[PDB]
Structure 1
Amino acid sequence: TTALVCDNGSGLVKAGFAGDDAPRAVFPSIVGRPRSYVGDEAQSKRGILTLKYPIEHGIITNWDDMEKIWHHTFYNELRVAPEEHPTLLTEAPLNPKANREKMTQIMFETFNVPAMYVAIQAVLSLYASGRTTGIVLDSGDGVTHNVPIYEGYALPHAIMRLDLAGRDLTDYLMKILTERGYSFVTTAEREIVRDIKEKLCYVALDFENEMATAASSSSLEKSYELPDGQVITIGNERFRCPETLFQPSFIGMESAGIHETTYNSIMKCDIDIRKDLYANNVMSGGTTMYPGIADRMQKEITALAPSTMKIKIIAPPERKYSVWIGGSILASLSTFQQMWITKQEYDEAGPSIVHR
């Protein structure tokens, strides 16, 4: 029996079979309804339907649309019979015991699954790097977290939720490409702007130092080819966009940037384990994808910590999917097997069995 792994993202469902490679079913988590349709299809029929966003920010909010998600995941992309395969879904950090409890209930009652598990995404990401202790920076489409973890357990009041993430950075690149004269504010064709963000732009090691080079190097700026014939160019705004991570103030937030969030997260934690936290520090998810973000982070934390502090950033080449892979690893893990919840024991204890 192949088990199943579903990572439910603020912008994206990343899902597929355990036995680690990658999720082969990855789609925008969106629910369209007549003024039901799920995924990229909803992007296509957009405006004829009103898209609702169940997993926006951290937590699954309205459950009905979520059901629509898991149905489409199972029955369409994944193309399986949920009755057959034990399923592992992920959850945001700080996710409340009732969120988790109604997840399990929808699993067993709606999809008829044999067994299941709900696991904390940023612990899966720390698993995929071969670690049981450390601090993850999990940065997605809609949320960001700094999750301290010790002996597999994420330390509850350590976690710092930044409400800034990839969709917001896409918005910022809209704003600042417009200021450069480029013409797309359109909620349709902005689906190309994102692409720019993903293909070219990056994180400066020293911001102003690189924005001193604003016009100096012509090969500092890059050439972007639109899907159709026409082509355009991208200047300094390139590195200026992911900068918003470290300086949230760019979009107007009064929250700390990253390195801070990271830092006082570590600092919330017990004095002993602090060392191990700095040493093992794992960045995960598609907004941790910008080139050079690891080193910039590195220098910026080396700044906050003492002189003698061993500080390492672990930024895996495959980390866009970090959680999900840590999912596969965990599901396919053998000693994990006894920890699965089953219909037997849910029907025994009800949804509140989900606590371990």
Structure 2
Amino acid sequence: EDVQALVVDNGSGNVKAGVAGDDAPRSVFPSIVGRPKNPKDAFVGDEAQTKRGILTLKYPIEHGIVTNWDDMEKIWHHTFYNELRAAPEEHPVLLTEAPLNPKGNRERMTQIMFESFNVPAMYVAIQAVLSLYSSGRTTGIVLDSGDGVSHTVPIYEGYALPHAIMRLDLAGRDLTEYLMKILHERGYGFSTSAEKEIVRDIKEKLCYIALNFDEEMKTSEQSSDIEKSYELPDGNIITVGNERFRCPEALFQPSFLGKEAAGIHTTTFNSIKKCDVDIRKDLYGNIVLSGGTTMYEGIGERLTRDITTLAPSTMKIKVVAPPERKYSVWIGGSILSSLSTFQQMWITKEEYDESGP
């Protein structure tokens, strides 16, 4: 009867895991499985990256959706055993899923949890909903942007509105790749998987979102103050200039990436418009950012301008950028699975097996 849930948030780039009641995930590792290029059968996370020379690396989650189930099971085994040292068959588990995850996918994850890992009880939560709860809200629209996907998710009185959810295949890995591309202007030829990791870190350390892109291009050309430096692993220094804000500008102008997609401002607006007129004011007034790709300096200020421009002038636009938003999905899961009512929300293994199954 006395038992603490495990909380596992499954992302395209990283898994976040830990125990209900903690204020942050203690386990964060890359969502990567390596298997021998030619003869364990498999390696996960940080260790896989150190053996890239002899392993073929794969990402089992593509744009937020689990697409390689055998490798996903390896990720989950790593999570429970290597990272948490927990017996999954002895803890309830909260697992997260993407907005608009097909039910067939949810069922396979459930089958693996109950029949591979023998979990005694499980609850599946929608990632964006957990983020909204972590912000102390029951109504709002969450913009969740990670490594592989971005979603805009209107939520009313606790629940997502499925007909209004937008998916956008443009997120942090695209931005990393774009920075790799534009650094060729200054003579860098970053291209390997290891080099991509370095450029990801450059992006995180030096990039920012311009309040007005055209004006920022102008001002940055007038002096060298735009230039900022980063120490590479070999001790060499790289200097980056207007690439600092041109890189995340692709969130607003996907044409920079050769994509026809609408930018994140337009997508958020379109998502709100799908909702009936009578609830839009509460959505515009509660635009909540979630996920690592929302961490850029300047993002709230820029989104506020751009959504204000698109929206009716009677609306009151408020973009909320919680300081802990990077792992607000996981944090919302930790809160939910800690509640006195959580035991009434889950499905038990006996129920599943007799459903059946």
- Place the TM-score, normalised by the shorter chain, in its bin: over 0.9
> 101, 105, 110: which one pairs with 2:107?
101
Alignment check: 8 A CA contact 2:20 2:338 kept: yes
Deviation at 1:39, TM superposition (A): 1.0
Q: Distance in 2 between matches of 1:280 and 1:180?
A: 41
Q: Distance in 2 between matches of 1:305 and 1:183?
A: 42
Unaligned runs of 5+ in 2: none
Q: Distance in 2 between matches of 1:106 and 1:138?
A: 26
Query: For this pair of structures, how many residues does the alignment match?
Result: 351
Q: Distance in 2 between matches of 1:125 and 1:136?
A: 7
The secondary structure found in structure 1 opposite 2:328 is helix
The secondary structure found in structure 2 opposite 1:260 is helix
What do residues 275-296 of structure 1 show as CA deviations (whole Å, max 9, x unaligned)? 1111111110000000110110
Alignment check: 8 A CA contact 2:142 2:288 kept: yes
Deviation at 1:157, TM superposition (A): 1.5
2:335 is the alignment partner of 1:329: yes
The secondary structure found in structure 2 opposite 1:26 is strand
Q: Distance in 2 between matches of 1:267 and 1:19?
A: 37
Deviation at 1:215, TM superposition (A): 2.4
Match of 1:141 in 2: 147
> 187, 197, 206: which one pairs with 1:200?
206
Match of 1:354 in 2: none
2:73 is the alignment partner of 1:67: yes
The secondary structure found in structure 1 opposite 2:63 is coil
Aligned AA (1:198): E
The secondary structure found in structure 1 opposite 2:194 is coil
Match of 1:262 in 2: 268
Deviation at 1:219, TM superposition (A): 2.4
Deviation at 1:228, TM superposition (A): 2.6
Q: Distance in 2 between matches of 1:40 and 1:297?
A: 34
2:351 is the alignment partner of 1:348: no
2:228 is the alignment partner of 1:222: yes
> 307, 312, 318: which one pairs with 1:312?
318
Deviation at 1:335, TM superposition (A): 2.2
Q: Distance in 1 between matches of 2:68 and 2:306?
A: 38
What do residues 265-318 of structure 1 show as CA deviations (whole Å, max 9, x unaligned)? 000111111111111111100000001101100110011112221111111111
Deviation at 1:346, TM superposition (A): 1.1
Q: Which residues of 2 match residues 22-171 of structure 1 at below 5 A?
A: 22-35=24-37, 36-171=42-177
Aligned AA (1:286): G
Aligned AA (2:28): V
Aligned AA (2:150): T
Aligned AA (1:28): P
Q: Distance in 2 between matches of 1:192 and 1:279?
A: 37
Question: TM-score, normalised to structure 1's length?
Answer: 0.96
Q: Distance in 2 between matches of 1:206 and 1:337?
A: 49
Match of 1:177 in 2: 183
Q: CA RMSD in A?
A: 1.2
Deviation at 1:229, TM superposition (A): 2.4
What do residues 38-63 of structure 1 show as CA deviations (whole Å, max 9, x unaligned)? 11111111141111221021210121
Deviation at 1:241, TM superposition (A): 0.3
Aligned AA (2:20): A
What do residues 72-113 of structure 1 show as CA deviations (whole Å, max 9, x unaligned)? 000101111111111000001110111111111111111111
Q: Distance in 2 between matches of 1:178 and 1:138?
A: 30
Q: Distance in 1 between matches of 2:261 and 2:196?
A: 27
Q: Distance in 1 between matches of 2:222 and 2:25?
A: 42
Q: Distance in 2 between matches of 1:335 and 1:349?
A: 23
> 4, 11, 14: which one pairs with 1:12?
14
What percent of counterpart residues are identical? 82
Q: Which residues of 2 match residues 291-310 of structure 1 at below 5 A?
A: 291-310=297-316
Q: Distance in 1 between matches of 2:31 and 2:300?
A: 28
The secondary structure found in structure 2 opposite 1:41 is helix
Q: Distance in 1 between matches of 2:221 and 2:266?
A: 30
2:219 is the alignment partner of 1:213: yes
Moved more, 200-209 or 219-228: 219-228
The secondary structure found in structure 2 opposite 1:246 is coil
Aligned AA (2:292): G
What do residues 212-234 of structure 1 show as CA deviations (whole Å, max 9, x unaligned)? 02322332221222223221211
Alignment check: 8 A CA contact 2:62 2:148 kept: yes
Alignment check: 8 A CA contact 1:178 1:185 kept: no
Q: Distance in 2 between matches of 1:100 and 1:188?
A: 33
Match of 1:189 in 2: 195
The secondary structure found in structure 1 opposite 2:225 is coil
